[PDB]
Amino acid sequence: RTIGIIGAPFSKGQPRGGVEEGPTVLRKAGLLEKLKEQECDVKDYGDLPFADIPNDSPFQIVKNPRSVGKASEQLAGKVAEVKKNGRISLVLGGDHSLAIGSISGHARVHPDLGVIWVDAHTDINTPLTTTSGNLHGQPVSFLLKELKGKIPDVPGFSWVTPCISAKDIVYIGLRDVDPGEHYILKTLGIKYFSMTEVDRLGIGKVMEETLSYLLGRKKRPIHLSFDVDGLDPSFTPATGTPVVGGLTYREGLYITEEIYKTGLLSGLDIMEVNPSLGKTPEEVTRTVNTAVAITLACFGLAREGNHKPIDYL
Amino acid sequence: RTIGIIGAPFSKGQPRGGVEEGPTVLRKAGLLEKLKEQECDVKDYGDLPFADIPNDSPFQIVKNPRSVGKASEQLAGKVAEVKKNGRISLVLGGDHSLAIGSISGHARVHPDLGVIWVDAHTDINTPLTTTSGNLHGQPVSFLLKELKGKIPDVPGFSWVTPCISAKDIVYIGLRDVDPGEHYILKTLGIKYFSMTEVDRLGIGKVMEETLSYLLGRKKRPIHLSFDVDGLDPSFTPATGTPVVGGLTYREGLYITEEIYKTGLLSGLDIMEVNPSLGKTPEEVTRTVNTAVAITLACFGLAREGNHKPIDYL
Amino acid sequence: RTIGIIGAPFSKGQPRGGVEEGPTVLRKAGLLEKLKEQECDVKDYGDLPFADIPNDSPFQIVKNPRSVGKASEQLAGKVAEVKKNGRISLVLGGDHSLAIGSISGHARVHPDLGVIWVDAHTDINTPLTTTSGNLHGQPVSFLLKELKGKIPDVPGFSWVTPCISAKDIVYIGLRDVDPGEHYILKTLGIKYFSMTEVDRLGIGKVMEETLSYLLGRKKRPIHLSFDVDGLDPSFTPATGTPVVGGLTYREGLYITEEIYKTGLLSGLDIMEVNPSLGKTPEEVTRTVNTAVAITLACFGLAREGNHKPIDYL
Ligand SMILES: Nc1ncc(CC[C@H](N)C(=O)O)[nH]1
Ligand SMILES: Nc1ncc(CC[C@H](N)C(=O)O)[nH]1
Ligand SMILES: Nc1ncc(CC[C@H](N)C(=O)O)[nH]1
Ligand SMILES: [Mn+2]
Ligand SMILES: [Mn+2]
Ligand SMILES: [Mn+2]
Ligand SMILES: [Mn+2]
Ligand SMILES: [Mn+2]
Ligand SMILES: [Mn+2]
């Protein structure tokens, strides 16, 4: 598969700072090379230089809005640029607020995209429903067209144009959803598979319904926004908001292996990896190793094996 | 949901003493408040004062029969009292022998009840089949009508009247069943889903069949006797008789979420939590945290989220 | 069930030496007795004395070929001897190269056998496809008739006669397969259930299809070659080549419980247990305990319980 790597060392979407190092440790794990070790054509677009914005007081309760707003605007342009070069955008975060720019830049080139959001949270709070003020928990509210009119003019996001309907997104892995967020889910009829549904149906049926839900009518580009805390913290502990009872390592690989097999992966986000939150050096490597594995699976690595079209005997 | 909390700090049903502290640490985890934080109407009936019975020599091989017998008699009355106040009895144990009084007091008010027993063990040994003499492994033999006549007159249990047929109970989580207990299962035709069945069918189908088995004919009150060792010891280690290969945290939450959704939960037991058996302070908090989560799920907490009937936007 | 225990303390199939102690620690865990504690008729044939072969230089890239070749030849005769005494051969390894002699000696007495290979690897590299040269990763290539002609004359294996077709074997647990090995899988049409399939279908359906695939046409003797690294390293860490995302303890017990229930188990291999690779004394006991449990399940131990044909009441 053909890839376009984009490092997004941003953290102002939430309180903890170590997430900016995500691009660094993932590249350090040898992600670029391992992808190349596969049938992959990789082009590194570099780590986005997120210039400082010293003056950025809260918007009501919303924190660092100008910084978060600019980082997504910068990222949106980069993703659109890689999508125009005919490559799958691979955004290494960074907190999940960056999803706003990633899905935005993607839709500029591919407006018919479908989103699969793997996360323990829905990240669909509005500036008015959020109680924490952390924008990494509001990315989805800015992208939904149905929520246009409920999103006040927050400094830094005047460039945003809702680009996805409630029916063009599927959540997988939910287990920590706020009351207002749950109201929006049920109100806009958003398709989701929380841990309850995964436990009931099995990851296989879950993925079956997910892809059929998004590709039933017609084939379209797929955007995978993967928050590493969607997986159980026993696999990805070095993350800002871990929630027990998460997706297993195996389910995480199953999800991505299936998405790969559709041949429609167009955009990918690997977010919330925070090395500084690993209680040990091993928890840090465990998180990075798991994040790399999910990434490789998105581009071809199959657990049953892979072989080149040649006679090996 | 409307609840009636009853602390049952009892341990004489087995050798290890720390189980009496169960009510204490669960309340200390803020269980009462967290329930209230939900759509719950809570009334604390207090911790049952289990007076000492210094003279209580074994009955043949059966240990502390008078103490265990009195504690269940005392508890049976309390549960019946809360069931008459129109509230779901929530008994915080304490060893599982207390189930004898809980299910007894429940049936006095609701004789048509159905029991779901989540445990790694069947706890259906009779005074004559048990090899350990620990009554926390015999509670079910005293309640089954079919076993009336095989239960000798043990000091402390003259007040007992079998109140459930073999067909009114479903076991879930079995993985350590004695030979005589297995004989009784197959002989009385008791419905069970051991870990083998959970592995074969999946927790979803397991719960589907469980509820259909008990509510097929008609809707009736449900009694959930939950032994925390039914879950894998990686989740609830501070318990007297842990057995590897247990139900996962997720399956445990799935079970209870489904029971809640029936709207028929009438009685609930959270047993065998023993803080003093935690090899570390974390194993103790891990056990308590997991016990609280299963409890909250029984009364409404859903992993997909919850919201009040109001317009959040 | 009637058993014939054979200790195979061999390690020259791979670099790490501690695997030779497998028979020792498994017997030390009280395996013989625990089997007897069940409905089992056990006869210990002893630990095969694998005489030294000082002169054994590599064959091209293949390491210790004469040593590995002789150990399998010796083992093949022992297994055939126990199969003629009407007993299920239970080979305690030892690295997995010994499978060559075990399945060989088994087929001498029961040529219509069917093989179930539980392993994280396919172990089907040929002397020409292997990149490591470790024979414990080539056992299957020597047994397949379809691969006859692609297996050069390696010193120590002139006694070998391919005894199984590609269609008489089923793989379960795959997650680390080489490119050439994957080519052979797809080329000979070998039936396999990698971790992806287990995640998709569930262990129940996996076992359903496995047994139907092998016993569909007609009932035949079953050979179970179980590599302990097929299970997740959180359960069996003391093994030379652990791979994360493996079969759970429960799935491992489900697999064997089902095989037992067919009443067709004829040959069993418990391989790759290496005590010296346990980072702690507990990792060593955890591995051994799990290896014993899978073994007991192969001969009757059911998680739902077991009882003698007598009236327990
Ligand atoms: N990725 C990620 N971790 C936590 C969030 C937000 C959760 C919370 N409901 C909030 O509104 O801040 N998003
Ligand atoms: N909750 C609970 N843990 C262990 C038991 C009894 C098990 C054993 N068969 C006995 O008869 O004592 N019950
Ligand atoms: N049991 C077992 N662990 C590792 C292997 C071989 C794996 C590798 N493909 C090789 O060719 O050496 N077999
Ligand atoms: Mn997120
Ligand atoms: Mn999240
Ligand atoms: Mn119990
Ligand atoms: Mn128990
Ligand atoms: Mn192997
Ligand atoms: Mn292996």
3-state secondary structure chain A: CEEEEEECCCCCCCCCCHHHHHHHHHHHCCHHHHHHCCCCEEEEEEECCCCCCCCCCCECCECCHHHHHHHHHHHHHHHHHHHHCCCEEEEECCCHHHHHHHHHHHHHHCCCCEEEEECCCCCCCCCCCCCCCCHHHCHHHHHEHHHCCCCCCCCCCCCCCCCECHHHEEEEEECCCCHHHHHHHHHHCCEEEEHHHHHHHCHHHHHHHHHHHHHCCCCCCEEEEEEHHHECCCCCCCECCCCCCCECHHHHHHHHHHHHHHCCEEEEEEECECHHHCCCHHHHHHHHHHHHHHHHHHCCCCCCCCCCCCCCC
Q: ∠ at Cα A182 (A179, A186), nearest 5°?
A: 140
Q: How far apart are the first and last CA of chain B?
A: 26
Write out chain C residues lying below 8 Å of B150, CB-based.
Answer: 313
Hey, which residues does B118 pair with through a beta bridge? Answer: B172, B226
CA–CA distance, C228 with C271 (Å, rounded to integer) = 6
User: Would you call B182 helix, strand, or coil by DSSP?
Assistant: helix
Residue closest by Cα to atom 3 of ligand 1: A241
- Element housing B282 (H / E): helix B281-298
User: Would you call C259 helix, strand, or coil by DSSP?
Assistant: helix
Query: Which residue has tokens 């429903």?
Result: A129
Tell me whether residue A96 is one of the annotated catalytic residues.
yes
Hey, which residues does B193 pair with through a beta bridge? Answer: B172
Burial-class residue C57 by CB neighbours within 10 Å (0-12, 13-18, 19+).
exposed
User: Which chains pack against C, by 3+ Cβ pairs within 8 A?
Assistant: A, B
Q: Kindly state the DSSP code that residue B54 receives in the 8-state scheme.
A: -
Within chain A, what is the greatest distance between any pair of CA atoms?
A: 67
The closest alpha carbon to B270, from B25, B22, B48, belongs to B22
Evaluate: CB of B227 within 6 angstroms of ligand 2.
yes
Write out chain C residues lying below 8 Å of A286, CB-based.
Answer: none
CA–CA distance, B208 with B219 (Å, rounded to integer) = 15
CA-to-CA separations, C270 to A302, C28, C95, in angstroms, rounded: 27, 15, 9
User: How many domains does chain C contain in total?
Assistant: 1
**Backbone φ/ψ region at C247: left (φ over 0), alpha (ψ -120 to 50), beta:** beta
Determine how many CB atoms are found less than 10 A away from the CB of residue B308.
Answer: 11
Determine how many CB atoms are found less than 10 A away from the CB of residue C84.
Answer: 12
Residue C109: phi and psi, rounded to 5, are: -90, -35
CA of A229 to the centre of ligand 1 (A): 10
Q: Kindly state the DSSP code that residue C189 receives in the 8-state scheme.
A: T
Evaluate: CB of B137 within 6 angstroms of ligand 2.
yes
CA–CA distance, C2 with B133 (Å, rounded to integer) = 34
E strand spans, C13-129: 41-47, 88-92, 114-118
Evaluate: CB of B232 within 6 angstroms of ligand 2.
no
| Tally of residues, chain B | 313
Query: Using CA of residue B137, residue B142, residue B143, residue B146, what is the dihedral sign?
Result: positive
Please tell me whether the peptide bond between C22 and the residue prior to it is cis, using omega within 30 degrees of 0: no
CA-to-CA separations, B291 to A169, A199, B237, B256, C112, in angstroms, rounded: 34, 19, 11, 11, 52
Angle between helices A203-215 and A249-262 (to 10 degrees): 30
CA–CA distance, C305 with B182 (Å, rounded to integer) = 6
- Amino acid B247 reads L
Residue pair B177/B185 in contact by the 8 Å Cβ criterion: yes
- Element housing C271 (H / E): strand C265-271
Instruction: Please enumerate residues of A whose Cβ is less than 8 A from a Cβ of C.
Output: 202-204, 249-251, 253-254, 257, 302-308, 310-313
For residue A211, the enclosing domain spans: 1-313
Tokens of B91: 């008994």
Burial-class residue A54 by CB neighbours within 10 Å (0-12, 13-18, 19+).
exposed
Query: Which residue has tokens 């069940």?
Result: C38
The closest alpha carbon to C290, from A249, B245, B235, B240, belongs to B245
Q: Nearest by CB to B305, which of A185, A201, A202?
A: A185
Contact C180 A254 (CB under 8 A): no
Q: Nearest by CB to A303, which of C150, C187, C196?
A: C196
Q: Which residues contact A280 (CB under 8 A, 6 or more apart)?
A: none
CA–CA distance, C198 with B271 (Å, rounded to integer) = 34
Residue pair B66/B40 in contact by the 8 Å Cβ criterion: no
Tokens of A128: 């008015």
CA–CA distance, B181 with C304 (Å, rounded to integer) = 10
**Chain C residue at shortest CA distance from B247:** C250
Residue B268: phi and psi, rounded to 5, are: -140, 135
Hey, which residues does B43 pair with through a beta bridge? Answer: B4
Strand order across the C265-271 sheet: C41-47, C2-7, C88-92, C265-271, C222-227, C114-118, C169-174, C191-194
Residue closest by Cα to atom 12 of ligand 2: B137
The closest alpha carbon to C248, from A231, B199, A244, belongs to B199
Evaluate: CB of B63 within 6 angstroms of ligand 2.
no
CA of B3 to the centre of ligand 5 (A): 32
- Total CB pairs under 8 A between chain A and C: 70
CA–CA distance, C19 with C238 (Å, rounded to integer) = 9
CA–CA distance, B143 with A167 (Å, rounded to integer) = 52
Q: Nearest by CB to A174, which of B249, B303, B306?
A: B303
CA of B123 to the centre of ligand 7 (A): 7
**Chain A residue at shortest CA distance from B303:** A175
Q: Nearest by CB to C312, which of B175, B180, B195?
A: B180
CA–CA distance, C46 with C44 (Å, rounded to integer) = 5
Residue pair B11/B18 in contact by the 8 Å Cβ criterion: yes
Write out chain B residues lying below 8 Å of C312, CB-based.
Answer: 129, 179-180, 183-184
Tell me whether residue B227 is one of the annotated catalytic residues.
yes
- Tell me which ligand sits closest to the C-alpha of residue B177: 2
**Chain B residue at shortest CA distance from C257:** B196
Beta strands B114-118; B169-174: pairing state? parallel
Residue C290: phi and psi, rounded to 5, are: -70, -35
B195-206 burial by CB neighbour count: b if 16+ within 10 A, else e?
bbbbbbbbbbbb
CA–CA min distance B309, chain A (Å)? 9
CA–CA min distance A234, chain B (Å)? 11
Q: How many CA atoms lie within 13 A of B303 on its CB side?
A: 34
- CATH (domain of A189): 3.40.800.10
Contact A304 C244 (CB under 8 A): no
Query: Which residue has tokens 């350990």?
Result: B132
Hey, which residues does C112 pair with through a beta bridge? Answer: none
Determine how many CB atoms are found less than 10 A away from the CB of residue B41.
Answer: 14
Q: Kindly state the DSSP code that residue B15 receives in the 8-state scheme.
A: S
Tokens of C289: 């305990």
C67 marked as binding residue: no
What radius of gyration do chain C's Cα atoms show? 18
CA–CA distance, B206 with B209 (Å, rounded to integer) = 5
Determine how many CB atoms are found less than 10 A away from the CB of residue B66.
Answer: 18
CA–CA distance, A250 with A260 (Å, rounded to integer) = 15
Contact B196 C304 (CB under 8 A): yes
- Amino acid C113 reads L
Residue closest by Cα to atom 8 of ligand 3: C137
The ligand 3 site (C-beta within 6 Å) comprises C 96, 119, 121, 123, 125, 130, 132, 134, 136-137, 178, 227, 229, 241, 272
User: Which chains pack against B, by 3+ Cβ pairs within 8 A?
Assistant: A, C
Residue A22: phi and psi, rounded to 5, are: -50, -55
Alpha-carbon A232 to chain mean position: 16
Contact A307 C179 (CB under 8 A): yes
Ligand 3 atom closest to Cα of residue C119: 1
Q: Kindly state the DSSP code that residue B138 receives in the 8-state scheme.
A: -
Ligand 1 atom closest to Cα of residue A119: 1
The closest alpha carbon to B268, from B50, B24, B35, belongs to B35
CA–CA min distance C138, chain A (Å)? 14
**Chain C residue at shortest CA distance from A290:** C244
A123 marked as binding residue: yes
CA-to-CA separations, B155 to A240, B54, C76, in angstroms, rounded: 57, 14, 62
Tokens of A256: 């991505």
Q: Nearest by CB to B250, which of A179, A184, A195?
A: A195
CA–CA distance, A235 with A229 (Å, rounded to integer) = 9
Q: Which of A117, A144, A196 to mutate to test the interface with B (most CBs of B within 10 A)?
A: A196
CA–CA distance, A178 with B310 (Å, rounded to integer) = 14
Tell me whether residue A136 is one of the annotated catalytic residues.
yes
Evaluate: CB of A129 within 6 angstroms of ligand 1.
no
User: Would you call C58 helix, strand, or coil by DSSP?
Assistant: coil
Q: ∠ at Cα A147 (A143, A152), nearest 5°?
A: 90
The closest alpha carbon to B101, from B74, B124, B122, B125, belongs to B74
CA–CA min distance A80, chain C (Å)? 33
B124 marked as binding residue: yes
CA–CA distance, C71 with C14 (Å, rounded to integer) = 13
Hey, which residues does B62 pair with through a beta bridge? Answer: B59
Reported resolution in A? 1.9
Residue pair A166/A112 in contact by the 8 Å Cβ criterion: no
Q: ∠ at Cα C298 (B186, C310), nearest 5°?
A: 30
Tell me, letter by letter, the H, E, C secondary structure of C98-149: HHHHHHHHHHHHCCCCEEEEECCCCCCCCCCCCCCCCHHHCHHHHHEHHHCC
CA–CA distance, C246 with C203 (Å, rounded to integer) = 12
- Total CB pairs under 8 A between chain A and B: 70
Ligand 2 atom closest to Cα of residue B272: 1
What radius of gyration do chain B's Cα atoms show? 18
Query: Using CA of residue B281, residue B285, residue B286, residue B287, what is the dihedral sign?
Result: positive
B272 marked as binding residue: yes
CA of A226 to the centre of ligand 5 (A): 9
E strand spans, B142-213: 169-174, 191-194
What radius of gyration do chain A's Cα atoms show? 18
The closest alpha carbon to A99, from A146, A156, A48, A141, belongs to A141
CA–CA distance, B265 with B116 (Å, rounded to integer) = 10
Q: Which of B207, B304, B306, B310 to mutate to test the interface with A (most CBs of A within 10 A)?
A: B304
B227 marked as binding residue: yes
- Amino acid A113 reads L
Determination technique for this PDB entry? X-ray
Q: Which residues contact B218 (CB under 8 A, 6 or more apart)?
A: none
Evaluate: CB of A241 within 6 angstroms of ligand 1.
yes
Ligand 1 atom closest to Cα of residue A122: 13
CA-to-CA separations, A9 to A26, A52, A98, A272, A292, in angstroms, rounded: 11, 12, 10, 10, 17
Q: Which pairs count as long-range contacts for B50-53, CB under 8 Å and 24+ apart, including other chains?
A: B50/B8, B50/B9, B50/B10, B50/B74
Please tell me whether the peptide bond between C86 and the residue prior to it is cis, using omega within 30 degrees of 0: no
Residues of C recognised as catalytic = 96, 119, 121, 123, 136, 227, 229, 272
Please tell me whether the peptide bond between B94 and the residue prior to it is cis, using omega within 30 degrees of 0: yes
CB within 5 A of ion ligand 8: which residues?
C 96, 119, 123, 227
- Element housing B252 (H / E): helix B249-262
Determine how many CB atoms are found less than 10 A away from the CB of residue C20.
Answer: 22
E strand spans, C176-257: 191-194, 222-227
CA-to-CA separations, B297 to A50, A196, B31, B251, B306, in angstroms, rounded: 43, 11, 12, 12, 11
CA–CA distance, C224 with C221 (Å, rounded to integer) = 10
